[PDB]
Design a protein around this nucleic acid. Structure first.
Lengths: 421, 415
RNA sequence: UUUUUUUUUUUUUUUUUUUUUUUUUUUUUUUUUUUUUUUUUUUUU
């Protein structure tokens, strides 16, 4: 309808509305530009010194990020790990058959000049070093993310990990909520280390030091929720990835989907850079984020909730998506899966059940399709005047009533308002 | 009916009522007049000094706006940012062709003479300067707007931002509510800076200092709510902008609409001056305001509420609009969209579903004409199903502030 | 006794402001107050 007129007086009006941008950036379409990920670990002073500046700065309640980065690089240059097979991503050849490589085999540059305390702090601290101190430093990255009292839930475990080798304790005193170390995550160089470590131990899963993954793990797939919700959807319906896809039933979800499955981005790859696209700063607007995939995110989570997901009762309810239609589509999917059990004899002793029996005996009209086929159901749905039948509605009610403790703006609370009146 | 007579005695009466004015002012119809936006950053004394007068005045509990403006101009003349493509708005050619430009490439004049403390304050403060001090100053603009305890919600984040570089803390002590800095927003020169900064970093989205956008952002589209509600309406119904338009069903909403879509105002433009029409003082009565688009604003928000918007349960309920009719029209729109799911197979494996296969059964899709007609058939009075639809949309809403269209909606439909 | 709205008037008549506002919306990115890994009956000589 490129053209709209106003009837009263036959004048043209040209409906337009403010431009929005934030185009996503994929990982591949970046190793076009550079062919290395720069890690500006700056000053290169003694490790013995650095071990000091931190062990102090920590107990103190302030310590330069610049210092901790430098210390980490220091205690982590263990060139451990022997390449099982080969290894390469996005063209970059990280190593190969049994080469020996270490964490920072992901691209080190140095820089700047200014620091803090002079040359050499308090010698008091020894090689109660690598062992555990780095783990702490990395641990805090995880803790620095959660905005809620749950943080002290993690820190608890964050140290009841820790105790392993020396049995120390707390270091700061100040809660968090953003101010303390909670802002380390804002240091492009810090994150790059966290990512490099996680990506590294994800490969050498078995390694005395692979315990460092604690707290370094919440960097893997950071800002890739949509991919995850898609994964859960499959697991939770029993359907294949291609079958689940066909059940997508509104454009902007298909749009979203197409956007996520763009090829040659290595998402199905074992150990690639793609999962850390954010923390290595490969991309500044993830294509797989839940906020750039709102329609999908809603549909997928609402559906899983109707199918009894626990995860899904607390997902966030995006804004500016087409709710009513998104949820009608979810209901249907949920209803189809919900009433047609896979159900098929699996083992036997000489006597199977052949499902056959002259498969026609009950309702032939408004009895809904047998299996889980989009076409059968779409058609059945047409037959129903494209308006949810009372049973579906009943299905939804019995899935959302008896949910309790629902945070507002979650799709849990949305679902319960919509269906359990 | 230019003529009204009184039956009892055949005398003419001439109904008239008080004149109202506030005609709107568009942005374009202004770069007719001037061709520059004047920024009277006054005194031009040392930055080192200024850094002082504020760092003091702040911790104190009073500091001249005049000073802070000057300080800002001081720490912000970073001529950073290299023009990606070209850049021009309303005729004004801001930059070009790989040019390098900085924030204040939007028109500086100087003025007046009088100030406050003498020449040089407390040297105590250094270049813990640009880094973070300006951000604070700008941050306050945002905080200075909200009239509610939510302000300390923003200031919280307003500093837990802050904490990056230096880790400082509070500066005033006195809450807010209009008195402290909450009045900086009244300084035509202050705002002009806020706008210039926002408009600048909206262009150079990627820039070490682009973090300054915090708190400078609520100036973008300030007093342009109607435009926003129209955008949400589209997003929330799934309809195109031209299709949504056709669902407008009462004159004064069409009037309103026509007013908003006046051409050559650059509203669909990426980075124009239009969004900052108020803070650059391009216009003193926005055409896009919610108060100059009441009917639209009501209709648009009511409809979105029926369609499950969360945003919309708290919109304000304008006065002096035609409620009953405005809401009948909204209901219908909401009912149409609400019952006809887009619903269409999108991916396949060799076997698509071809959709191919009464009286008071309502139209199939979402077409105004089909529905208008169906509605005629219904004696232009909402059927029991619609009414039911409305109820199930508004009951189970809780926590409604009064004068919101949330509360209006719940009173009308969930008896 | 004579009185009688616990009425008053003087003007009034939104415990409305119009100057601009109107999601007690938002840096951005983002969103199970998920997860180290192993487990996961606050089962047991």
């Amino acid at each position: 309808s490129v053209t709209v007129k106003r009837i009263i007086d036959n004048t043209v009006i040209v409906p337009k509305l403010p431009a929005n941008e934030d185009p996503v950036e994929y990982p591949a379409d970046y190793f076009r530009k550079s062919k290395e990920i720069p890690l500006y670990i700056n000053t290169t002073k003694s490790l013995s010194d650095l071990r000091g500046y931190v062990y102090q700065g920590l107990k103190s309640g302030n310590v330069s990020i610049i210092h901790v980065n430098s210390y980490l690089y220091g205690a982590l240059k263990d060139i451990r790990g022997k390449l099982d097979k080969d290894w390469s991503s996005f063209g970059i050849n990280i190593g190969k058959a049994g080469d020996t490589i270490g964490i920072f085999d992901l691209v080190s540059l140095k820089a700047l000049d200014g620091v803090l305390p002079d040359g050499v702090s308090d010698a008091s601290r020894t090689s109660a070093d690598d062992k555990w101190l780095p783990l702490y430093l990395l641990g805090l990255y995880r803790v620095g993310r959660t905005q809620m009292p749950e943080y002290r839930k993690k820190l608890m475990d964050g140290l009841t990990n820790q105790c392993k080798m020396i049995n120390e304790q707390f270091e700061p005193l100040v809660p968090e909520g953003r101010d303390i170390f909670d802002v380390w995550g804002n240091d492009s160089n810090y994150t790059k280390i966290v990512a490099a470590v996680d990506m590294f131990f994800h490969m050498f899963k078995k390694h005395e030091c692979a315990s460092f993954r604690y707290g370094t793990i919440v960097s893997r797939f950071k800002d890739c929720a949509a991919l995850a919700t898609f994964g859960h959807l499959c697991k939770i319906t029993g359907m294949s990835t291609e079958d689940v896809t066909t059940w997508i039933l509104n454009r902007e979800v298909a749009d979203e989907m197409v956007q996520m499955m763009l090829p040659g981005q290595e998402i199905d790859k074992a150990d690639s850079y793609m999962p850390y696209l954010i923390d290595f700063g490969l991309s500044s607007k993830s294509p797989y984020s839940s906020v750039k995939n709102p329609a999908f995110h809603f549909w997928g989570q609402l559906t899983a909730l109707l199918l009894r997901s626990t995860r899904a009762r607390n997902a966030r309810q995006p804004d500016d998506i087409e709710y009513t239609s998104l949820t009608t589509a979810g209901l249907l999917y949920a209803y189809a899966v919900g009433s047609s059990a896979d159900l098929a004899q699996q083992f036997c002793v000489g006597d199977n059940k052949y499902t056959p029996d002259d498969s026609t005996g009950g309702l032939t009209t408004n009895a809904p399709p047998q299996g889980r086929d989009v076409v059968e159901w779409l058609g059945w749905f047409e037959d129903q005047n494209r308006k949810p039948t009372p049973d579906m509605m009943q299905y939804a009610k019995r899935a959302v009533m008896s949910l309790q403790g629902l945070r507002e703006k979650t799709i849990g609370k949305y679902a319960k308002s919509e269906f359990d009146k």
